[PDB]
Amino acid sequence: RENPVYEKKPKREVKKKRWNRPKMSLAQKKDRVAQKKASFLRAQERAA
RNA sequence: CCCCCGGGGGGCCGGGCCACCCCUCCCACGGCGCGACCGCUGGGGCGGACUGUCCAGUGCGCCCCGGGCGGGUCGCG
């Protein structure tokens, strides 16, 4: 009751890094399918 | 006020403009050439992330570019 005022914590500038995983792009998403199919074949003639 | 045959015709002197040939402004429009500002799509380096049942591949960030493409705005010839 004698000091209800709130003093925010001082905001320090941060190193500005990224802990999260960025979203994959279309070119990458589309190229992975080409590798998955190609690797599925180049693994199939090894059995052949 | 004159002139040619009472009726038809011809002039009076100044000024500016267009006709032709010379020169030259600003503007409009179109064309050709050039330069500047924006847009789009090849290289290299750096940094980082990711993918692929062979070491290969794919964006993104920054920077430098040789460009290519195209239109707008601006400025010339």
UniProtKB/Swiss-Prot annotation:
**Where in the cell is the protein located?**
Cytoplasm; Nucleus, Nucleolus
Region annotation (Disordered) ranges? 6-48
Compositionally biased, Basic residues: which spans? 11-21
**Superkingdom classification of source:** Eukaryota
Phosphoserine found at: 25
- Where does the chain cross the membrane? none
Q: How does the record describe its quaternary structure?
A: Component of the large ribosomal subunit (LSU). Part of the 5S RNP complex, which is a LSU subcomplex composed of the 5S RNA, RPL5 and RPL11. Component of a hexameric 5S RNP precursor complex, composed of 5S RNA, RRS1, RPF2/BXDC1, RPL5, RPL11 and HEATR3; this complex acts as a precursor for ribosome assembly. Interacts with isoform 1 of NVL in an ATP-dependent manner. Interacts with RRP1B. Interacts with IPO5, IPO7 and KPNB1; these interactions may be involved in RPL5 nuclear import for the assembly of ribosomal subunits.
Q: Which family does it belong to?
A: Belongs to the universal ribosomal protein uL18 family.
Purpose of the protein = Component of the ribosome, a large ribonucleoprotein complex responsible for the synthesis of proteins in the cell. The small ribosomal subunit (SSU) binds messenger RNAs (mRNAs) and translates the encoded message by selecting cognate aminoacyl-transfer RNA (tRNA) molecules. The large subunit (LSU) contains the ribosomal catalytic site termed the peptidyl transferase center (PTC), which catalyzes the formation of peptide bonds, thereby polymerizing the amino acids delivered by tRNAs into a polypeptide chain.
Q: What is this protein called?
A: Large ribosomal subunit protein uL18
Its lineage reads: Eukaryota, Metazoa, Chordata, Craniata, Vertebrata
Q: Which gene encodes it?
A: RPL5
